[PDB]
Amino acid sequence: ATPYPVKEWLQPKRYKAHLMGTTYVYDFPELFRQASSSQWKNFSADVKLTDDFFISNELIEDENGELTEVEREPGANAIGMVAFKITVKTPEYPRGRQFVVVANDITFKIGSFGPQEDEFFNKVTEYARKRGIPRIYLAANSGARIGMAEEIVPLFQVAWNDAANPDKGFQYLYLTSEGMETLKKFDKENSVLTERTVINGEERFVIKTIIGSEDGLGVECLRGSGLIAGATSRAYHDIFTITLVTCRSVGIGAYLVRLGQRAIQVEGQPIILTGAPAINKMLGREVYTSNLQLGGTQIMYNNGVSHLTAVDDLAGVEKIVEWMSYVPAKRNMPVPILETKDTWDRPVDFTPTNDETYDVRWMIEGRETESGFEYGLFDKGSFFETLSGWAKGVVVGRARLGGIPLGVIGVETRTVENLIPADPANPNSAETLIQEPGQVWHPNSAFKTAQAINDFNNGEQLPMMILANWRGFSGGQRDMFNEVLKYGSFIVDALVDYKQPIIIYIPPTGELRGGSWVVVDPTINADQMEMYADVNARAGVLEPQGMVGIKFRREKLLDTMNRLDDKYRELRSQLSNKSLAPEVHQQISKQLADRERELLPIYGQISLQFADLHDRSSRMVAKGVISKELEWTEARRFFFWRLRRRLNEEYLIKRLSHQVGEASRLEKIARIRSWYPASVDHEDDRQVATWIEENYKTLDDKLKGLKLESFAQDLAKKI
């Protein structure tokens, strides 16, 4: 009979949790242990983990409401919101990093949000924020806590219109002196707001407002939803936030998942507002058959609300751990550099061809060809895609470049068949398929791009590379009506807001035209952006077919003919050098038309090539619009050292902006680069980075001392 203690017996709560299809909240810490363990297996199997590599500390409020640490038997939570402070030693943080886990106890009042759960959830968020560590939220709730005064139930009355016929209706509810007394025989007068009265022989205290002695019935909870809605809203711009939906999320539940932005949905676990049964009655019909139709994975994932989906709670936890490996340990710390086995010093194997279609992910991480492995731009097996089920025109995810973490955005060259499911509420609604052309921003892909730039920026504080390859925005009616202009603008706002280095880069077979260029041009945020174009990329306000349709028309094509074709030329002269007889002019005009009707194609071809010669990177360098043109196969090596140099100098600027007399970026960049010895030329990225890194110790000193002179000069002289 079970060789070991049945845990669902020792703690029935655990069984209720399992009965509702989710993990028992006090069992989630172990799930994070298991995932952190795998993190190491997948990175270095010969590593031997002790037991102190993972530490989970439960946090509960003390008397002054200050969260402290407590070790105690699970199932002892007085409120339905629990929290843990994890501090685990991971590959990118051998000495360990820390984060907090906030979770609804789904067994406690079905995970409902009451004033206490709310204030606790808020108290925890500020705990993380003040420390700068990530805030993980496991959501499994039933929303705001509802209720009625159960004390007024057993004793209210009905001022009927006609006592002997209740059907005729009533006029008001009230309590008898008896009831009015029954309340104090327990001290619950506040439970109601009455108004004295007498009648055909009796007392009548009409109820004007039922309030209830119990806390957590209505608006006070609503008040608490808002405290935490704005708290998360704020946290997202301050620390790495992320929510995992483990059973379901309703009301502020569905709003907290979104406000935290990054969200992982376990399949079968709905994210909803008002439930299907409620909607059905509302609509007076049996329209929906399951909450999944409202907030299931085919909605929230295809929608973009859920950045990822997981088959079960453990899978979802492993995805949170994986996501964190890219983020800094705490706010304002250098990005977690984890050198893999895929050295930076190598060529880039897979290369596109302006013919055969390709998956942009190949360029990103590589291809597993039937004859070996073609390495991509980034570290082998490092790409961690996100928002994969929404706006597939774009490809966003995290990655590592020579061990350096960064956000990556690519363009999907293949046409996406976005299939929209019919609306059950509309008897004559039809499943419909939208075809989204590759290399073109649509309302959804623009918004997605914006979302990604913002998520790399706010909590992750990451560098980012955009393999820009857009022919523009869709300008057709439908997409203009769907406000592609608004989502397109969001892109600019996101880049202006970005605080880490940005690399824009038109890849090989790529191009970046009119509308698309304006939203990614370095000038938008000169401080962090830089653009590069592959020697084999293209760029211009219009495409040749377009550029020609306006500045290389027929007449012009013909002028080129008369100048470059002997037959057409000599023919032109005969029609304009001598007065010919009608019969002869006709005879020759025909020979003209037929010649035009034979060279025209080739010549039209010639004009395109003329146009395409301006759309070259060489011109980009010439006009000073990019920083450099590059050799694709050499990109990895090049960017590896450009990012590392950029990052290294940025870290120095930030320090040189923590003291007193704030100076312009320029000056800080001056002061810094004068620290370099003649033996290292500024223009050399690998020369600078290596330098800064080899002297961090020394540098650290120079900066600290720089502050001392300040915080002691303004004082020494403050006479």
Give the residue with the Cβ less far from ligand ADE, 164 or 550. Answer: 550
For residue 638, state whether it binds a copy of itself (rule: CB under 8 A): no
Give the residue with the Cβ less far from ligand ADE, 144 or 571. Answer: 144
Bridge-based pairing of strands 529-534 and 308-310 is unpaired
Site size toward a copy of itself, by CB under 8 A: 142
Q: How far apart are CA 427 and CA 336, in angstroms?
A: 53
The answer to whether the beta carbons of residues 79 and 89 sit under 8 Å apart is no
Taking residues 234 to 273 in sequence order and writing x for each that binds ligand ACO by CB under 6 A, - otherwise, the string is: ----------------xx---------------------x
172 three-state secondary structure: strand
For residue 145, state whether it binds ligand ADE (rule: CB under 6 A): yes
Exactly one of 550, 678, 715, 716 binds ligand ADE (CB under 6 A); that residue is 550
Q: Is 144 a known ligand-binding residue?
A: yes
Burial class (CB in 10 A: 0-12, 13-18, 19+), 701: exposed
Residues numbered 248 to 287 that lie near a copy of itself (CB under 8 A) are 251-252, 254-255, 257-259, 271-275, 278-279, 281-282
Q: How far apart are CA 326 and CA 39, in angstroms?
A: 13
Q: Which amino acid is located at 677 in the chain?
A: P
Task: Render the burial of 109-129: b for 16+ CB within 10 Å, e for the rest.
Answer: bbbbbbbbbbbbbbbbbebbb
Choices 136-144, 365-373, 483-491, 604-612 (CB under 6 A): range interacting with ligand ACO: 136-144
Exactly one of 74, 393, 403, 472 binds ligand ACO (CB under 6 A); that residue is 472
Q: Is 515 a known ligand-binding residue?
A: yes
Residues numbered 485 to 544 that lie near ligand ACO (CB under 6 A) are 514-515, 541
Beta bridge partners of 629: 533
**Rg (Cα) of the chain, in Å, rounded?**
34
CB 600 to ligand ACO: min, Å: 19
Phi, psi dihedral angles at 327 (to 5 degrees) = -85, 155
For residue 388, state whether it binds a copy of itself (rule: CB under 8 A): no
Looking at residue 552, the DSSP 8-state letter turns out to be S
Length of the chain: 719
Cα atoms found within 13 Å of the Cα of residue 695, Cβ hemisphere only = 17
What number of other Cβ atoms are within 10 A of residue 270's Cβ? 24
Taking residues 520 to 559 in sequence order and writing x for each that binds a copy of itself by CB under 8 A, - otherwise, the string is: xxxxxx-------------xxxx--xxx-xxxx---x--x
Residue 295 interacts with which of a copy of itself, ligand ADE, ligand ACO, none, CB < 5 to 8 Å by class: a copy of itself
H or E segment to which residue 265 belongs: strand 263-266
CB 292 to a copy of itself: min, Å: 10
Give the residue with the Cβ less far from a copy of itself, 156 or 651. Answer: 156
Taking residues 96 to 115 in sequence order and writing x for each that binds ligand ACO by CB under 6 A, - otherwise, the string is: -------------xx-x---
CB 142 to ligand ADE: min, Å: 4
Q: Is 553 a known ligand-binding residue?
A: yes
Q: How far apart are CA 288 and CA 280, in angstroms?
A: 7
For residue 513, state whether it binds ligand ADE (rule: CB under 6 A): no
Give the residue with the Cβ less far from a copy of itself, 102 or 329. Answer: 102
Q: How far apart are CA 489 and CA 476, in angstroms?
A: 17
Q: How far apart are CA 678 and CA 689, in angstroms?
A: 15
Residues numbered 99 to 118 that lie near ligand ADE (CB under 6 A) are 112
For residue 480, state whether it binds ligand ACO (rule: CB under 6 A): no
Give the residue with the Cβ less far from a copy of itself, 51 or 555. Answer: 555
The answer to whether the beta carbons of residues 396 and 448 sit under 8 Å apart is yes
For residue 471, state whether it binds ligand ACO (rule: CB under 6 A): no
Q: How far apart are CA 257 and CA 242, in angstroms?
A: 8
Q: Is 692 a known ligand-binding residue?
A: no
| Dihedral, CA of residue 23, residue 27, residue 33 and residue 39, to nearest 10 | 0
The answer to whether the beta carbons of residues 100 and 136 sit under 8 Å apart is yes
Q: Is 145 a known ligand-binding residue?
A: yes
H or E segment to which residue 642 belongs: helix 635-655
Q: Is 146 a known ligand-binding residue?
A: yes
Looking at residue 503, the DSSP 8-state letter turns out to be E
Give the residue with the Cβ less far from ligand ADE, 217 or 502. Answer: 217
Residues numbered 129 to 168 that lie near a copy of itself (CB under 8 A) are 143-149, 152-154, 156-158, 166-167
Site size toward ligand ACO, by CB under 6 A: 20
Exactly one of 218, 275, 424, 438 binds ligand ACO (CB under 6 A); that residue is 275
Cα atoms found within 13 Å of the Cα of residue 334, Cβ hemisphere only = 20
Scanning 246-358, the segments in alpha helix (DSSP H) are 252-259, 276-282, 292-295, 297-303, 313-324
Taking residues 463 to 502 in sequence order and writing x for each that binds a copy of itself by CB under 8 A, - otherwise, the string is: ---------xxxxxxx-xxxx-xx-xx--xx-xx------
Residue 379 interacts with which of a copy of itself, ligand ACO, ligand ADE, none, CB < 5 to 8 Å by class: none
Give the residue with the Cβ less far from ligand ADE, 253 or 410. Answer: 253
Exactly one of 274, 357, 369, 657 binds ligand ACO (CB under 6 A); that residue is 274
Q: How far apart are CA 564 and CA 601, in angstroms?
A: 14
Q: How far apart are CA 401 and CA 394, in angstroms?
A: 20
| Contacts with ligand ADE, residue ranges (CB under 6 A) | 112, 142-146, 550
**Annotated binding site for CoA, which residues?**
248, 551, 553
Report the interface residues with ligand ACO, using CB under 6 A: 109-110, 112, 142-146, 250-251, 273-275, 278, 472, 514-515, 541, 550-551
Mark the binding-site residues, compressed into ranges. 144-146, 248, 515, 551, 553
